[PDB]
Design a protein around this nucleic acid. Structure first.
Ligand SMILES: C[C@@H]1CCO[C@H]2Cn3cc(C(=O)NCc4ccc(F)cc4F)c(=O)c(O)c3C(=O)N12
Ligand SMILES: C[C@@H]1CCO[C@H]2Cn3cc(C(=O)NCc4ccc(F)cc4F)c(=O)c(O)c3C(=O)N12
Ligand SMILES: [Mg+2]
Ligand SMILES: [Mg+2]
Ligand SMILES: [Mg+2]
Ligand SMILES: [Mg+2]
Ligand SMILES: [Zn+2]
Ligand SMILES: [Zn+2]
Lengths: 66, 47, 261, 242, 261, 47, 66, 242
DNA sequence: CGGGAAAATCTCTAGCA
DNA sequence: ACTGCTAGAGATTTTCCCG
DNA sequence: CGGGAAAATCTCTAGCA
DNA sequence: ACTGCTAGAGATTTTCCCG
């Protein structure tokens, strides 16, 4: 039930930036999504990113590929 | 309190000092002689 | 330094020497020279060396009017994906800007439009068109195209493609639609190797899917967490760390000194 | 890897599709595709429909995505081939249009529309369009008084139809449906691309005869030999291109 | 890929898809798609992302004419040091450019002048003034102020200082000379914490001193070196490495496999 | 041999291909239809 | 005689750039000067730099200071 | 460090200056300065001279660096205070001009020239100028036919005088001499700055009485106590500011 | 050896027609 | 065959100074 | 584990009134 | 209370592939 839903929410890749770095940070793992913030995991680090600085996709291309 | 000197709009002459009302990431809101203006942080210095 | 400072202001009132020159010529600590410069109004002539970061939420679009061969091209872009819409219009008028905006809002979920302060966008006719479709208008700091970095960058890619295909069309509107097609579906790269069309499809489908999934997750997973405080609402748990939202403030706490109920 | 046999069994029992096996058991999509393709007992998103309605003395030119009911329409000055080809080039730039169905009317069989379809890569072929024309006309009649010109009313009707009216099995609107269907086609195309990439590779494992390649994992290599899926360690198999 | 390549060129002739889009849509190796793009004339629309480096020898000066309050200001700069000279002149004319250049060459060792291709610098009257003082003229690639990065950057600092002191002078020529003074002697920093005046003094004195010292060193230290070749002329030795100049080609060799005679 | 496409002088339209005669650090010398030109390396691509 | 001259030529600081780095490299030690090239020592490394990319000074301030 | 005693001896023998001790024995300049300042038996570059010559009906206004013979001249339209003050502001912007000697002529005692000197920081005081005027006139007479106007000829003469005519003890031209003299003044000013910086510090070593500070090295601290220079390890002395 | 403060370095920007 | 740079503002790392 | 080649990342630029 | 970016070209580091 719930665990399938959580492992599905963690299948989406998140591209984000920090408040003073102009370069986009590579695909993290989406843990939780909200109206104003998303919670991600990037290299065994848990960051909270505003919604306006994050791009969340699935990569229908790496899915279909393992 | 903070003094803010700025470059408002298509004008090369820097103006100031103005009261800092709000500092966001990238832009600031100031008050310069009962006139509220929004200046990007590329065009303003805050002291 | 009382004699060294009084002579330094007397020299700054004339030459406006920077903090270093006054530190060398009057034997001052760097802080004192920097202070003397910082108190001079005529020396505050330079901003700080950074750039902001535009909004890249899934519902934000940047619009702008660019010009080519005497004609007006109204261009829009989906900021999260790079998907562009464009159209040659006879005039920069709020009427046709509103027509363009209504067409756009009818084809895609447009939550917010970001534009500069051109008269066609600040028109009372676009305000009515954005109110009807439930769109939010964000205008930028006047005379700052950097606040429209995305659409202004798209004004260059679009014009660049048009010159590549201009000789396959008699009229400029055909070349504009060809360029829209080519950009959206024949140029791949970016954050997923996608084209702009694939990327907008992914962005929008992912938004819907994640909203539904997290709605289910919150409907089922209902816990309260005490840490170090009040019953913060649980958001996520695992890997020896817990994420919670205490009074609309999301913070990350380790699994230690935190109990889930 | 370890669930390939379970997926084979679940297909031989329930005749499921590869999406479910790949989601339920955690298999690369190519392996589940081969599982569903090994049983002979177990054997649209780019098609739009075009037509022209007449209303208040002007010509509305409507386009429907058949799979989703999504509608693209606009008022044109003249029912001609120039404006039809322009509408079609626009649509093809907005959505991946692979085929368009029309009613052999004069504006649709023109050389300009044919040339536009050739450039965009659209295949021209000569009752959903009628029902959606009826629904669009009903919505237009509803919302007509909120605008002065007809083209504005048509765009408000298109907005209402695509995003405000919901229905079907899950209660989704035409916009969400078209987005989901296009995402599904993107997945299908990516899978076909990967299958086509790997199909020109042969694997020699343990040496045994050549085998078809399915997946080149980080700790294993999946192969299909004599209509049977087997797993071999990477160091125990050599992949060559043919 | 013969069927995949023939279809890709047919698609590129229409849409001009970049190498990635044609690698994804036609199953091509990146090299083949990049080749198909590289052979299209209509796609070669972007230069390489670098910048050059101007000459900063001790004898190079960059000159330029800038405008302020309807008046013409002829500005020069010593590239190695940042020392500027300036003058308000009534007209951008080779006559007064030549007067300025002769004054400059009389006050400092001017070996070479770098300028853009304005008519006053490309004048036959400056060619005579530069020939008489033994100056070498380097003109830049036309319509490339980056080739004058130093003097163009100095057109901004000079104008910036003038506005700081403009209200201490009735005329603009006085403010220009005030700004020259302030820049050259009241602004410190750079490669030695110097001002422009101190730095030009150091550069020139160091040039003279090092030329004299190395003349003596070569007059005394006279050796030939064989390495791995011919009798290369010795330049320096120490710290387990030898520097020599074999047929006008300076290269560094270690102390091993090298004998000094 | 090398093809060089370039952007000569105050003109947005890229030209080429031209023969590469000399590659310096920052600028190149090319030959385009019996016309020798000096183009900076910001304004030229060499293939 | 000669050794004083060499240790004097090595008292001058050299600021230089490489052919693709826009930033100026800190003060090296001048070993040999020529018409077209200077030979320097930067962090126990011997580099040959063209004359047009090098600024050679003494730093009258660090001399007068040890 | 180790040569301080040798330098003291060489001064008590030959009465040398601190530049030589600092160059010969390898001492920080402040230590050699104190060595030369401890003996009471052992006890210009910013001064220019201005004047006006008349030639061919025009007024040439010449400036000489007394220490080097370097010359700055130019033809002015009128022997007035505006042009004199402009010439002086120009010169002060080019070279570090600390003092200017003039001949109390009307143009030199004007309020504009006085205000220019005040702004630039020049001290006004009211036979080298005459000899250099003669030499400049001789050169001008030589080179006059190579130009049409007189101002151009004056600048060619200034170029010749400053860089083409060489003489003196070492055979250097006026340009090299002025550059060397200004470099020497830069060294002198930097040394005075460092001495002034360190003179407000007192050192307590081994605790003994306070001592004047001279140098704060990387492996030692040099101090002067009771007119005697001693070396102490950094860990053996504490420096305070007073 | 350990923090804190001050100094040095690094990064990045507008303006220069 | 020729060529972006300069100075200032804020951030971040190094060095030094007393324990 | 060791080179080589190919792929991924990094760095940096013009143009967008 | 708001905000530079995008895509391409060359350089450099990572990954992979067979020994
Ligand atoms: C008639 C002469 C001859 C032919 O060309 C024109 C036009 N021009 C244009 C600029 C200018 O665009 N400065 C802005 C800028 C841009 C980029 C950069 F790196 C440096 C910069 F200063 C000049 O400064 C300048 O002197 C001239 C000029 O002199 N001429
Ligand atoms: C009359 C409206 C309202 C008020 O202001 C004007 C003037 N303007 C100027 C540019 C422009 O300067 N683009 C160059 C650029 C410079 C920097 C950057 F980051 C991005 C850039 F695109 C525009 O694009 C633009 O749309 C306008 C415009 O619309 N208006
Ligand atoms: Mg605009
Ligand atoms: Mg714009
Ligand atoms: Mg110019
Ligand atoms: Mg210029
Ligand atoms: Zn000031
Ligand atoms: Zn092409």
């Amino acid at each position: 039930e719930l665990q399938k839903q959580i492992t599905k929410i963690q299948n989406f890749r998140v591209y984000y930036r920090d408040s003073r770095d102009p370069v986009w940070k590579g695909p993290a793992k989406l843990l939780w999504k909200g109206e104003g913030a998303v919670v991600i995991q990037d290299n065994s680090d848990i960051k909270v990113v505003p919604r306006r600085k994050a791009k969340i996709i699935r990569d229908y291309g790496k899915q279909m590929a393992g | 309190n903070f003094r803010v000197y700025y470059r408002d709009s298509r004008d090369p002459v820097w103006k100031g000092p103005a009261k800092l009302l709000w500092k966001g990431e990238g832009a600031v809101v100031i008050q310069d002689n009962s006139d509220i203006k929004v200046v990007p942080r590329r065009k303003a210095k805050i002291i | 330094f009382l004699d060294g400072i009084d002579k330094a202001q007397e020299e700054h009132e004339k030459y406006h020497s920077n903090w270093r020159a006054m530190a060398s010529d009057f034997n001052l600590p760097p802080v004192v020279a920097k202070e003397i410069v910082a108190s001079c109004d005529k020396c505050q002539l330079k901003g700080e060396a950074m750039h902001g970061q535009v909004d890249c939420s899934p519902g934000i679009w940047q619009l702008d009017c660019t010009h080519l061969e005497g004609k007006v091209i109204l261009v829009a872009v989906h900021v999260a994906s790079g998907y562009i819409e464009a159209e040659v219009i006879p005039a920069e008028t709020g009427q046709e800007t509103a027509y363009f905006l209504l067409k756009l809002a009818g084809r895609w979920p447009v939550k917010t439009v970001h534009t500069d302060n051109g008269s066609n966008f600040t028109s009372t006719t676009v305000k009515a068109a954005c109110w009807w479709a439930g769109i939010k208008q964000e205008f930028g700091i006047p005379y700052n195209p950097q606040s429209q970095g995305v659409i202004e960058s798209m004004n260059k890619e679009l014009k660049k493609i048009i010159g590549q295909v201009r000789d396959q069309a008699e009229h400029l509107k055909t070349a504009v639609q060809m360029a829209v097609f080519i950009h959206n579906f024949k140029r791949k790269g970016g954050i997923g190797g996608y084209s702009a069309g694939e990327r907008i499809v992914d962005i929008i489908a992912t938004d819907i899917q994640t909203k539904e999934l997290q709605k289910q997750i919150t409907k089922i997973q209902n816990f309260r967490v005490y840490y170090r405080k009040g019953p913060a609402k649980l958001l996520w748990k695992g890997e020896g760390a817990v994420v919670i939202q205490d009074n609309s403030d999301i913070k990350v706490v380790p699994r230690r000194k935190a109990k889930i109920i």
